[PDB]
């Protein structure tokens, strides 16, 4: 079905698939610790994971894949997809990362966890790139869909590539109808996808970091995060 959808029907289907924005259990009158922060945001990531699965099977052409494909795709992209959500959410709060509407972390609060401040920095730099580029909600949902279908596709799929081509058409559709000239269209599309490469980078850094927090066991992780985590291979000296 995904293939015979108009560009417009694509954008709508994706906007309606959007997972909700979740809240931290964070209680503001309590002080922070490497443990309490890591607790708050793995608690948050773990509940968000559940909603991402859902959104995944509402992405056109995703239910069409074998269940194992589905699994592989998600195991590969899960942190990138939380990250691009983060980065998009923090857009209108420059200098800060809106993990949750009541969990706004600034640059200094990343020092609270060793090895976190550099991923903080990369993350702020990305949302800053988005804002500077003035990314649109509609373009954002396309990018997110691209990561889901693209990140794992090379470690196994015509179907996936054809869907990926449909989302690319839609991105351009959006630009062509926003007034952008022809070269402006293809330049913005390049700048967009080039940013996905950075997100992949942050994902690998943050995954190594997560495994690090497990290793020095500053917080017990959930069963799902551990599964997510273990689909990747890592270490920590």
């Amino acid at each position: 079905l995904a293939l015979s959808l108009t560009a417009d029907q694509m954008v709508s289907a994706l906007l309606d698939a959007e997972p909700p924005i979740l809240y931290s259990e964070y209680d503001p009158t309590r002080p922070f610790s490497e443990a309490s922060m890591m607790g708050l945001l793995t608690n948050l990531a773990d509940r968000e994971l559940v909603h991402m699965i859902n959104w995944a099977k509402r992405v056109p052409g995703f239910v069409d894949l074998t269940l194992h494909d589905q699994v592989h795709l998600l195991e590969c992209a899960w942190l990138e997809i939380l990250m691009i959500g983060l980065v998009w959410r923090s857009m209108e709060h420059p200098g800060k990362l809106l993990f949750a509407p009541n969990l706004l972390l600034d640059r200094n609060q990343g020092k609270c966890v060793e090895g976190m401040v550099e991923i903080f920095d990369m993350l702020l730099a990305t949302s800053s790139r988005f804002r500077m580029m003035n990314l649109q909600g509609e373009e954002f949902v396309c990018l997110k869909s691209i990561i889901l279908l693209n990140s794992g596709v090379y470690t196994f799929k015509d179907h996936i590539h054809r869907v990926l081509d449909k989302i690319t058409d839609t991105l351009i559709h959006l630009m062509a109808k926003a007034g952008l000239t022809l070269q402006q269209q293809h330049q913005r599309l390049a700048q967009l996808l080039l940013i996905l490469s950075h997100i992949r980078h942050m994902s690998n850094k943050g995954m190594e970091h997560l495994y690090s927090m497990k290793c020095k066991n500053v917080v017990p992780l959930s069963d799902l995060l551990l599964e997510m985590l273990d689909a990747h291979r890592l270490h920590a000296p």
Partner: peptide
């Protein structure tokens, strides 16, 4: 595998 089940459910 929790994932598998959240996906089938």
């Amino acid at each position: 595998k929790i994932l598998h089940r959240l996906l089938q459910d």
